[PDB]
Amino acid sequence: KRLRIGITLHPYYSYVSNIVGDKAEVVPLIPAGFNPHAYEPRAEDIKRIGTLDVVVLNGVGHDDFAERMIASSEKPGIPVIEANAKVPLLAKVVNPHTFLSISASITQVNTIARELGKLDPANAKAYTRNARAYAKRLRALRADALARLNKAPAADFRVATIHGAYDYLLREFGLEVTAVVEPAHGIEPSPSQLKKTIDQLKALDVKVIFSEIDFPSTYVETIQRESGVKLYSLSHISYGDYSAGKYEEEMARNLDTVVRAIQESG
Ligand code: NI
């Protein structure tokens, strides 16, 4: 009767909780504290799918584990909400970190609310109303961060990141990522690859590097020393407890750090 909705990543817990409020139950597929990049399906977690009515998926490359878990469960035909159905992607591998964008988060929130409404019509109007209030808060969060930005960065403001998570985030400043240290999503560089990346940061005069707060890497100190590139850190919104407010709290901090990096470039 009261929908039981599965989620895969922390941002989706925040989206669904804000959409449904107390009208439905939000169930994480994997426990808090586990790195979703390294998570391997456990029997205990696959069992949980059998008690759900629907699973919300990133479905564009950040939760492949969830499709495998569903296939191995008691409900392989469980309804699935493809959150990114209406989201413009980039770019050669499609970047799956659409949740680290205010505009793409609003699109995903609206898609989730519409789809949950079709599954639970008695609550369709409430889900729509809640999604619109949540989208208003996300726009305000972005406006508040931009209220601290004086100028756009100079033409020479090149940016690098350790994890390939921030292309959508930086796109909201009209900025691009020159280089990503990890050769592929969540893959540590070899010593030869890291040396080549350091050489590239120097050759292209990269100004800043955004590292990971969530599951940090031990070679970042070497990059800073060897390249002279200013270091800032961002959240993939993937560490610790699930909470309705996690997404907005950590995105506000992400946007403030990007603004600070630009402010400190001049
Ligand atoms: Ni990632």
The alpha carbon of 210 and the centre of ligand 1 are apart by a number of angstroms equal to 14
Q: Are 229 and 208 in contact (CB under 8 A)?
A: yes
* H or E element at residue 92: none
CA 75 to chain centroid, in Å, comes to 27
Which amino acid is it at 49? I
Method used to solve the structure: X-ray
The alpha carbon of 165 and the centre of ligand 1 are apart by a number of angstroms equal to 6
The alpha carbon of 73 and the centre of ligand 1 are apart by a number of angstroms equal to 25
In angstroms, the CA 96 to CA 118 distance is: 26
The alpha carbon of 63 and the centre of ligand 1 are apart by a number of angstroms equal to 10
The alpha carbon of 36 and the centre of ligand 1 are apart by a number of angstroms equal to 8
The alpha carbon of 23 and the centre of ligand 1 are apart by a number of angstroms equal to 30
In angstroms, the CA 92 to CA 176 distance is: 16
The alpha carbon of 188 and the centre of ligand 1 are apart by a number of angstroms equal to 12
The alpha carbon dihedral of 220, 221, 227, 231 has a sign of positive
Expressed in Å, this structure's resolution amounts to 1.6
Tokens representing 63? 């939760």
The alpha carbon of 236 and the centre of ligand 1 are apart by a number of angstroms equal to 7
List b or e across 81-117, with b for residues whose CB sees 16 or more CB atoms inside 10 angstroms: bbbbeebeeeeeeebbbbbbbbbbbbbbbbbbbbbbb
The answer to whether 10 is annotated as binding is: no
Q: Are 160 and 179 in contact (CB under 8 A)?
A: yes
C-alpha to C-alpha distances, 5 to 48, 94, 212, 218, nearest whole angstrom: 11, 26, 29, 37
The alpha carbon of 266 and the centre of ligand 1 are apart by a number of angstroms equal to 30
The alpha carbon of 124 and the centre of ligand 1 are apart by a number of angstroms equal to 32
